[PDB]
Amino acid sequence: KNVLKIRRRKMNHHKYRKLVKKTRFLRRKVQEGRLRRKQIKFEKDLRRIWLKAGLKEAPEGWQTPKIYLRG
Amino acid sequence: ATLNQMHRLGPPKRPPRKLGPTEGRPQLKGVVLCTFTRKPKKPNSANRKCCRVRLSTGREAVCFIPGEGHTLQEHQIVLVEGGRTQDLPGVKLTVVRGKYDCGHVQKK
Amino acid sequence: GRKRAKPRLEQDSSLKS
Amino acid sequence: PMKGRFPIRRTLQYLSQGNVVFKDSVKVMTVNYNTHGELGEGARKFVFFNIPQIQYKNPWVQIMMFKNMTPSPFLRFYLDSGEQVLVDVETKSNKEIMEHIRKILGKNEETLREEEEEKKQLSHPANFGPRKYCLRECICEVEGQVPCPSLVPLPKEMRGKYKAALKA
RNA sequence: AGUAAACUGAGAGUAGAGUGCUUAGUUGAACAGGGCCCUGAAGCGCGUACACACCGCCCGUCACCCUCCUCAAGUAUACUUCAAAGG
RNA sequence: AAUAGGUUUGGUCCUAGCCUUUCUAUUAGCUCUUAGUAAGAUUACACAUGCAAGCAUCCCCGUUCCAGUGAGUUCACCCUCUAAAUCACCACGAUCAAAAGGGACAAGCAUCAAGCACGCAGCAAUGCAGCUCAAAACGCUUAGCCUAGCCACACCCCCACGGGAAACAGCAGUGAUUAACCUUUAGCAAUAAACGAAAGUUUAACUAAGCUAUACUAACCCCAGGGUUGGUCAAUUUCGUGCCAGCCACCGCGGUCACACGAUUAACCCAAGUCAAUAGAAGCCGGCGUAAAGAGUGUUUUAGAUCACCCCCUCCCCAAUAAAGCUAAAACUCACCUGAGUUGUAAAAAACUCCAGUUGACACAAAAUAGACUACGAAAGUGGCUUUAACAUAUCUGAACACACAAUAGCUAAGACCCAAACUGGGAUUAGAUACCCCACUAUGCUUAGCCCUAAACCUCAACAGUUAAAUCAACAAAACUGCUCGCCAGAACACUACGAGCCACAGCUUAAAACUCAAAGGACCUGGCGGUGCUUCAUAUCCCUCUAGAGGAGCCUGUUCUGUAAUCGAUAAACCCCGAUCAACCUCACCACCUCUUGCUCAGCCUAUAUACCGCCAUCUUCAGCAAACCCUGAUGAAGGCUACAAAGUAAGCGCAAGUACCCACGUAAAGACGUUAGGUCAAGGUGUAGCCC
Ligand SMILES: NC(=O)c1ccc[n+]([C@@H]2O[C@H](COP(=O)([O-])OP(=O)(O)OC[C@H]3O[C@@H](n4cnc5c(N)ncnc54)[C@H](O)[C@@H]3O)[C@@H](O)[C@H]2O)c1
Ligand code: FES
Ligand SMILES: [K+]
Ligand SMILES: [K+]
Ligand SMILES: [K+]
Ligand SMILES: [K+]
Ligand SMILES: [K+]
Ligand SMILES: [K+]
Ligand SMILES: [K+]
Ligand SMILES: [K+]
Ligand SMILES: [K+]
Ligand SMILES: [K+]
Ligand SMILES: [K+]
Ligand SMILES: [K+]
Ligand SMILES: [K+]
Ligand SMILES: [Mg+2]
Ligand SMILES: [Mg+2]
Ligand SMILES: [Mg+2]
Ligand SMILES: [Mg+2]
Ligand SMILES: [Mg+2]
Ligand SMILES: [Mg+2]
Ligand SMILES: [Mg+2]
Ligand SMILES: [Mg+2]
Ligand SMILES: [Mg+2]
Ligand SMILES: [Mg+2]
Ligand SMILES: [Mg+2]
Ligand SMILES: [Mg+2]
Ligand SMILES: [Mg+2]
Ligand SMILES: [Mg+2]
Ligand SMILES: [Mg+2]
Ligand SMILES: [Mg+2]
Ligand SMILES: [Mg+2]
Ligand SMILES: [Mg+2]
Ligand SMILES: [Mg+2]
Ligand SMILES: [Mg+2]
Ligand SMILES: [Mg+2]
Ligand SMILES: [Mg+2]
Ligand SMILES: [Mg+2]
Ligand SMILES: [Mg+2]
Ligand SMILES: [Mg+2]
Ligand SMILES: [Mg+2]
Ligand SMILES: [Mg+2]
Ligand SMILES: [Mg+2]
Ligand SMILES: [Mg+2]
Ligand SMILES: [Mg+2]
Ligand SMILES: [Mg+2]
Ligand SMILES: [Mg+2]
Ligand SMILES: [Mg+2]
Ligand SMILES: [Mg+2]
Ligand SMILES: [Mg+2]
Ligand SMILES: [Mg+2]
Ligand SMILES: [Mg+2]
Ligand SMILES: [Mg+2]
Ligand SMILES: [Mg+2]
Ligand SMILES: [Mg+2]
Ligand SMILES: [Mg+2]
Ligand SMILES: [Mg+2]
Ligand SMILES: [Mg+2]
Ligand SMILES: [Mg+2]
Ligand SMILES: [Mg+2]
Ligand SMILES: [Mg+2]
Ligand SMILES: [Mg+2]
Ligand SMILES: [Mg+2]
Ligand SMILES: [Mg+2]
Ligand SMILES: [Mg+2]
């Protein structure tokens, strides 16, 4: 068979890889911001739990970890 | 698929039908913003009279004005219906001749 | 660019006659 | 074509051909059958062919199946009183199994005929209403009675538009 | 091959007009083997996204251009939830 | 989607979307006679005014109903238990029917996958740690519903103490708003409800009217309109227009013959309607080698299947895997001797010259021959030697995510480094060369320990079981199928993308949309064209060389081009260019300037346009040998194809070639030379279609 469908996919992937290459510094700043909001959204979900259960502060000795950082 | 698979998936779900430019409505009222002509896509050759109107829904759209000769002007009221102009890409609305400020085509 | 009609769509009146 | 072997089983006509309508005492029917063995062949055909018909006629009776739990196939019925009815089906054909449980726990043809008659009392022919519940909607449909004004206009004398006009 | 080459005459058409054309004759050769890049044909194949038929079709950057969407700093607005509780 | 139809291609078949035809509703345009009947804000936005609940010897009862709306939305159904209410009173019941308890009960999204206290035991104290959930919990979004009717709501804060605030979602009516638009009528006579002991009283419930082609039914002396008329699809004459104006549901139409545009004529269909827009009605038992689809591999879970007992025939070995050890050939390096060059290719340059050749020593790299074998392993992979360990399951099926793997490339750290080698540098090529060609060298290919988790991970054939008889079968691939199960798919493109989530991944992987756009996209095959396409044999004055005389340089002659001129036209690659002309000083003559004539040499005339309307006569391949009616057969009766002589489906009239004839023969030269190719040449030989001119 012909490879015309593969050729369409080939160009789409080449242009995408090149686009990501050109903007990899902007995309890295955007990704960093999303992970911060993701962490904040996670901390809120846990705070909602103890607050809806009648507690006024987090359980004694509980520190919400950073589960989205590269470290 | 097997009977067990057909049972587990259930009856087919139709895609929710896509509302057109009239948003599932027969006609819409619009206010003319500007008038101009559009070139039909090849192989057709013409200067098709179109206009941009603000629809009652708030969204602005390009509408084809059918017939030979019109007198539409900015700030005038027109009624627009569905129906694509086959040779005008993106033109999916048509002005209703004989309603509000758009009159009937003058004979010959 | 003179429009070239499709040969399969070419109309004929043999039946109409 | 319809998927599976014996697609007739998945038709409303087939499912309505069951003759076993359990008495109200029957609450649960367990079927213990074996996948292999020549002596359990009727029990396999009974599960294959007749369990769907039994369930169709007895939607509120729990039917549970158990494979290869014992050396021979048997049916056990649990009644509301607390009584249990063990039916040994080894060596019996599927048709004999259906005939057996019909005799010992199925409603006779007389008891079923009566129920059908009591249902006919619910749709009285003399009643008028929507076609869903009644044969006729209005007395105007009866020949000899004053027809509907939608089909035949009434005399001016029988119309309120003209009774008041003369009176006024 | 009486060919090429050379030489000589006649005719058509004009009132006249060609170094042109048509045609008759004279003298009168050399070579004819070997090859298939090229040119073209024949045969048998192979591929084909072209069919306006390779002067074909066709991909992408950039330019212009309209329609739609995504991301996005700071900020504002609106909405949702609470008492489904405790003393 | 059906009795189907149209639409992809040069063509055929297949697949597939879109659209047509049918039936309703709403709105728009245009049009419209009557009667009867039914039905009738777009808006849970704001409302002027009037009315919509009274009754009755005071108490009470009623105003908790009816009427309205569709905002919200699994309080509607069944069962159990049991209030209020009806049966004057008791009902020891029936009827009706709350609260409570049990069960059942919409759609879409899994890119909402975890919820976060959601359970149990105990008299209590208290103890246990459970409960829901891919068979869809939790969550988001949408929607009144299952219509003798039911549910919900009643301006908002779910509620209505309270607060905001001052309420038509009661009838009639109004404003705003929307494509959407009924009277500010009458009567309590009928029925229903309230009240009364009752005669009765009241009620915008309701009844009877008003308004409206939204529908139904009936009628019309008189009075018909709307749309359509290229195909689908019933039905077009004459003009105008000339890719413009416009048209089109789809395919498409429009550049001088427009049945498709506009007008006009006629016709077709329906008809007091017509039919433009919109919406709805008809959607899974079909597929997954190549069209969308078998996800790289195996396992199992809750389950499903009957392929599990019976009932049986490929255990061991060959290139599985892991570990350790080992080395034959060839490199590299070093040493001696010798040589002065070696390397590089179509050819060069650059590079090296402690270089090359012989001999010897020599690896953490890679594994000729066997292997023409077709084995091992789940797949990926696995082919030098030895040894150790070792290749799950006595029914099958069973995961993007669980579990464990998974070439090459790549990442992190420490090593090895012969050779190869991205990148980079140099040489050359080129219009350019960030390439192809040459040289050097690095990451990398190796080892160790961690990652990453992709492939055209492909026999492009899911696992298991069974069959070879049916129809063999769209096509090609790989003969055609059945049972059963899981996975997956539902026009193209957007998109191996966006967002979400997960991940040792951070320029990544996995899962994976939508908006705008289109009428196709796509699969297989056939034909043609073309190929910097293969092989083979050829051209006889012939493609190259060979033979002879020329052209190309000079002058002249002549044609054309260009320039010039007030001043023809045609030919114009082969197949124009001493060509139409076997011929222009006037004439010829068709051109230019000036002057003149107007029924004109002609029952006019035109060398005006169109050779892309033609006849006529020709060029061209042809320095060919084929064209072909009528039949027959093959391919499943697909587009297509049809020959074998020891013959296997072709027979063929006619035409051409041939034969014959002309010239001096039977040789040669002429003549002849089909169909078709170039819309080839000629409207200016003459004739002529169409269009144009007529002082
Ligand atoms: N998700 C479960 O834990 C679960 C439990 C019981 C049965 N199953 C069965 O697994 C099949 C797949 O279910 P789905 O479509 O809802 O899941 P899915 O394939 O959409 O996967 C969603 C989740 O289920 C897991 N899952 C996928 N396949 C599974 C399988 N075969 N068994 C168990 N877990 C699986 C995935 O890892 C993931 O966590 C069905 O046949 C279902 O009945 C699944
Ligand atoms: S339906 Fe009976 S009178 Fe109309
Ligand atoms: K179709
Ligand atoms: K009272
Ligand atoms: K609602
Ligand atoms: K409310
Ligand atoms: K009354
Ligand atoms: K038409
Ligand atoms: K070896
Ligand atoms: K392959
Ligand atoms: K070909
Ligand atoms: K010369
Ligand atoms: K001709
Ligand atoms: K002529
Ligand atoms: K002519
Ligand atoms: Mg692309
Ligand atoms: Mg249209
Ligand atoms: Mg109307
Ligand atoms: Mg009571
Ligand atoms: Mg209740
Ligand atoms: Mg899933
Ligand atoms: Mg998303
Ligand atoms: Mg709603
Ligand atoms: Mg209100
Ligand atoms: Mg309220
Ligand atoms: Mg009102
Ligand atoms: Mg209306
Ligand atoms: Mg009373
Ligand atoms: Mg009325
Ligand atoms: Mg089209
Ligand atoms: Mg035409
Ligand atoms: Mg015309
Ligand atoms: Mg027309
Ligand atoms: Mg595919
Ligand atoms: Mg596979
Ligand atoms: Mg894959
Ligand atoms: Mg398994
Ligand atoms: Mg798997
Ligand atoms: Mg799954
Ligand atoms: Mg994957
Ligand atoms: Mg790997
Ligand atoms: Mg590596
Ligand atoms: Mg090297
Ligand atoms: Mg370079
Ligand atoms: Mg290296
Ligand atoms: Mg090694
Ligand atoms: Mg492979
Ligand atoms: Mg499988
Ligand atoms: Mg798609
Ligand atoms: Mg990829
Ligand atoms: Mg991605
Ligand atoms: Mg993301
Ligand atoms: Mg010369
Ligand atoms: Mg000339
Ligand atoms: Mg010319
Ligand atoms: Mg010419
Ligand atoms: Mg030519
Ligand atoms: Mg003269
Ligand atoms: Mg002259
Ligand atoms: Mg003249
Ligand atoms: Mg010609
Ligand atoms: Mg002869
Ligand atoms: Mg000749
Ligand atoms: Mg001849
Ligand atoms: Mg021509």
Side-chain angles (χ1 to χ4, degrees), chain B residues 22 25-32 51 53-56 61-66 72 76-83 92-103:
Chain B
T22 58
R25 298 162 72 176
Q27 302 91 16
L28 293 181
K29 214 162 174 177
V31 176
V32 176
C51 65
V53 308
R54 193 178 60 263
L55 302 170
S56 59
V62 177
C63 306
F64 173 71
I65 309 163
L72 289 176
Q76 288 191 329
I77 308 298
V78 292
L79 188 74
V80 311
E81 64 183 344
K92 304 181 280 300
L93 295 174
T94 294
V95 176
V96 177
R97 305 301 307 255
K99 188 68 162 172
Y100 299 139
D101 295 1
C102 186

Side-chain angles (χ1 to χ4, degrees), chain B residues 31-85:
Chain B
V31 176
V32 176
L33 308 176
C34 57
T35 48
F36 49 91
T37 56
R38 285 286 183 85
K39 276 284 172 210
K41 73 197 194 168
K42 66 176 77 182
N44 285 9
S45 286
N47 299 284
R48 306 219 182 279
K49 282 58 167 178
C50 288
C51 65
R52 185 173 281 93
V53 308
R54 193 178 60 263
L55 302 170
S56 59
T57 59
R59 193 186 66 82
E60 295 168 28
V62 177
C63 306
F64 173 71
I65 309 163
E68 293 178 350
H70 73 81
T71 75
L72 289 176
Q73 309 179 12
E74 183 176 21
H75 302 299
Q76 288 191 329
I77 308 298
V78 292
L79 188 74
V80 311
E81 64 183 344
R84 68 195 278 271
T85 313

Side-chain angles (χ1 to χ4, degrees), chain A residues 12 24 59:
Chain A
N12 298 342
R24 67 189 196 268

Side-chain angles (χ1 to χ4, degrees), chain D residues 77-114:
Chain D
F77 297 86
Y78 298 81
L79 312 182
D80 197 7
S81 51
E83 175 180 12
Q84 290 173 28
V85 189
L86 181 72
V87 182
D88 184 2
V89 298
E90 192 169 43
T91 313
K92 292 189 165 178
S93 77
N94 63 304
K95 196 193 291 160
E96 296 166 17
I97 297 162
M98 276 288 263
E99 290 164 347
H100 185 92
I101 62 188
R102 189 193 187 184
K103 172 173 173 171
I104 59 163
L105 288 169
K107 287 174 181 173
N108 54 36
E109 298 175 1
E110 289 167 347
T111 300
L112 295 174
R113 286 169 54 266
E114 293 176 354

